[PDB]
Amino acid sequence: FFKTTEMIGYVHSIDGTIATLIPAPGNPGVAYNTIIQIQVSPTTFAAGLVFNLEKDGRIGIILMDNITEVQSGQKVMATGQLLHIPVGAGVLGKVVNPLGHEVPVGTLGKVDTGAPNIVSRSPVNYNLLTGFKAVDTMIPIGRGQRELIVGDRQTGKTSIAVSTIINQVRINQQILSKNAVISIYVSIGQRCSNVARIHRLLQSYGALRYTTVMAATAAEPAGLQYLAPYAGVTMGEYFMNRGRHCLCVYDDLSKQAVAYRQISLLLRRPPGREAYPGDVFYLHSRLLERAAMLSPGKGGGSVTALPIVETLSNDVTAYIVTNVISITDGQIYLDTKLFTGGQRPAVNIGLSVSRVGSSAQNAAMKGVAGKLKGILAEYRKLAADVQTIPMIRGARFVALFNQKQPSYFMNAIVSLYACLNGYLDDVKVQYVKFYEYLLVHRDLGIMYGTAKNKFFYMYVQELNYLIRFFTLNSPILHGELEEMLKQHTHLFLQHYQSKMNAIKSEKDVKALKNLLYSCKRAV
C-alpha cells in the first residue's frame, strides 16, 4: 500500500537541456522512448524522455521542465510508460504545453501513435474553406489533407492560417456540431508575445470556443519544441477517432528541426546534411502521416494539417523544405515580391498546387473554379508573350484575390461568378473592389427601388447553404442570380462610375483614393 516508484539510476552529466544517467547496479532498467522523473526534491520532479540506450548502460535524457533544478547525482525514477497527455473537449479555449500543462493567460492520448492504415482511409471529398478566394478556387483544400504553407519571413504564413481558423467560427455556429471544425494551433519556437497576440485575436472573434493553443516558446527547452507537433496532433486525433473533423496548424516545422538537431548533436548523434540528423525526414514524415480522412467504417473523422515553413531568399532547394514538400499533398507558396507589390495574400498560383484537385471543392465551386482556371492560364500567357475576354477578366480576377480577412462563401462565390460571366467587363480594374463592396454589404436595387427578386438577395446569409446544395448554375437560383447581377451592374455603372470618372479636384481625388484602398481591406 505504498506509492513505490521504480528507481533506475542517478544523474551523471548535464549539458544544457539534455542529460545523461548512470544506472545503479542491479536495477530493473528503463525502456526506450519512455518518460522518467528526476527527483529534484523529495516532492518535486523534472520530466525527461529517454533517447539513447548505450552499451555502457548510460542513458540519454531529453529534459522537458525544471531544468534549472537538475543537478548531478540526483535520483531518477522510471514510470515505464510512453508519453500520454490530456485530450478532450475540456481543453478547448486553453493554452497548454506539449506535456499538457495549462499556461495561465492574462481521457489520455498517447503522443507516439501510428498513422491510419491504408484500408482505414477514404478519399478526400469534404472541403475546408480557408476564406480566401485565391486558395479556395485555385488551391482546393479538403479535410484530411496536408497542405504546406511555404514562404519567406513576413509574407503572411501565420496570418493566413489564423484566418482559416477564424473563418470556421461563423460556420460552426450555424451547422450541427457534428460537422464543426475544431482547431489545434501549435506555436513552436515563437515569441511569447506573439502567442498572446494570437490568443487575443482568436478570442475577439470567439474562436477559442472551437480552438486550443499548444505553445512551446523560444525560452522553453528544445524538448518541448520537439514534442509540440506530436502533442498537438494527438489532441486532434481525439476528434478524428470519434467521427469529428479537426484542423492542426504547425507554426512552424522549421524551428522543430532545429530543436531536433540541437538535441541529437548534444547527445552525440552523427550529424548529416547541414548538421541535421540523418533521420530528419522520418521526423516530419510520421508527423504528417497521422493526418488522414478516416473511412466510413471507422467514423469518418479527419485531421487537416497546415504545416508552415520558412525559406531564405525564396530558396525552396533547402534540405528540410524539400523534405516537407515531398510529404504534403499540396503547397501554398507565398512570394515576397508579390507581397511587396500590393498582392495580399501573396499566393503564387504558378508555384502553388493542390494534389487533391477538384474533389476537395463543393459542387457550387467546381464549375466556377474550372472555368476560372482556364482564363487565368491564358491570362498569364497572353501578358507574358489586345483586350481579349480572357485578358479582360483575368485582371479582374487577380484584383478580386486581394483580401485582408476571410470571406463568407456566399459573398466570394457570387463575386467570382459575376466576374466570370463578364458582368465586370465595363467596370474598371481599380473599381472592382468598390463594386464588390456594394454588392455584398449594401443593396443598390432596394436603395433605388428596382429590385424585383423574390428571395435572392445578398443580405440573406442563409442562401449560402442553398447555393452549396444546388449550385449557382441551377434553374432554382440561376434566374434570380442573373437578374440581381444585371441590376447591380447597371445601377453601379450609372450612379457611381460616371461620377468617379468625373473627379478632377485634388480633394475629391484624394478622397476616392482612400475609399478604394479601404475597399481592398473591407471585402
Binding site: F2, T4, T5, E6, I8, P25, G26, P28, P42
Partner: protein, 200 residues
C-alpha cells in the same frame, strides 16, 4: 575479475576489507593521487590481497584508478547476490539518521511485497542526502518510497506605482437626435475622457 578470483578461494570478505583499507588510505593521499599513482611504491596498498593488488596495478596500467569506487560497488553487488542479501538504502537528512525505526519497518514491508527476495536476508544501509531536511526515503530493488520533505525576501510590489484609470468613451444611442447633435455629443465624450485622464 575480482569476483571470479575470490570465488575460487571461496572468501569474499577479504576484498571488502581491501576496499575499506584503500578508502581509508586515499583519505590521506594528496589531491589527484590517481594520476601520479604508483601502487607498488605506495605502502598503504602493500597490505592488500593479491587479487586486489593485481587489479589496482591493472587499473594503474590503463590509468583507470579513478574507477576504484565503481569497481567496489559492482563487486559488493555481486557478493550480496551470491550470498542472497538484499540491501535497502535509507536516505536520511544530514544528522537525521538517529531515528530509523520507521525506515526498518518500511524496508521489511517492501521486502515482504517482493516475491523474488523471499529467501534473501534483509540488510539496511544508511545514506545521507542533503536534498531532504525532514523525513526519510527507502529504496529496495528499485522500489522507492518517499516520506521526506525539503526546504519550503524580495520586493513584492511598488507602492508608488498606481494603475492608470482606464477611461471609457461614452456611447450615445443611435437616434435622429444623436445625428443632429453628433458634433456636440462627440465634444462631451472628448471632454469626459480628458477629465478622466487628468482627474477632474
Amino acid at each position: 575479475f575480482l569476483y571470479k578470483a575470490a570465488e575460487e578461494k571461496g572468501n569474499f570478505d577479504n576484498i571488502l576489507s581491501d576496499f575499506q583499507k584503500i578508502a581509508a588510505a586515499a583519505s590521506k593521499l594528496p589531491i589527484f593521487w590517481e594520476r601520479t599513482a604508483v601502487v607498488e611504491k605506495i605502502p598503504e596498498f602493500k597490505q592488500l590481497s593479491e587479487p586486489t593488488f593485481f587489479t589496482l596495478v591493472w587499473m594503474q596500467n590503463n590509468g583507470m584508478l579513478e574507477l576504484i569506487q565503481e569497481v567496489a560497488e559492482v563487486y559488493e553487488t555481486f557478493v550480496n547476490a551470491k550470498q542472497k542479501k538484499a540491501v535497502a538504502k535509507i536516505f536520511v537528512a544530514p544528522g537525521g539518521e538517529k531515528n530509523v525505526e520507521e525506515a526498518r519497518r518500511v524496508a521489511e514491508e517492501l521486502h515482504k511485497g517482493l516475491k523474488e527476495l523471499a529467501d534473501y536476508t534483509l540488510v539496511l544501509k544508511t545514506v545521507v542526502d542533503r536534498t531532504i531536511v525532514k523525513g526519510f526515503a527507502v529504496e529496495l530493488a528499485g522500489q522507492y518510497v518517499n516520506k521526506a520533505e525539503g526546504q519550503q525576501r524580495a520586493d513584492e510590489v511598488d507602492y508608488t506605482n498606481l494603475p492608470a484609470p482606464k477611461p471609457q468613451k461614452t456611447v450615445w444611442d443611435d437616434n435622429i437626435e444623436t445625428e443632429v447633435l453628433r458634433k456636440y455629443l462627440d465634444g462631451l465624450s472628448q471632454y469626459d475622457m480628458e477629465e478622466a485622464k487628468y482627474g477632474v
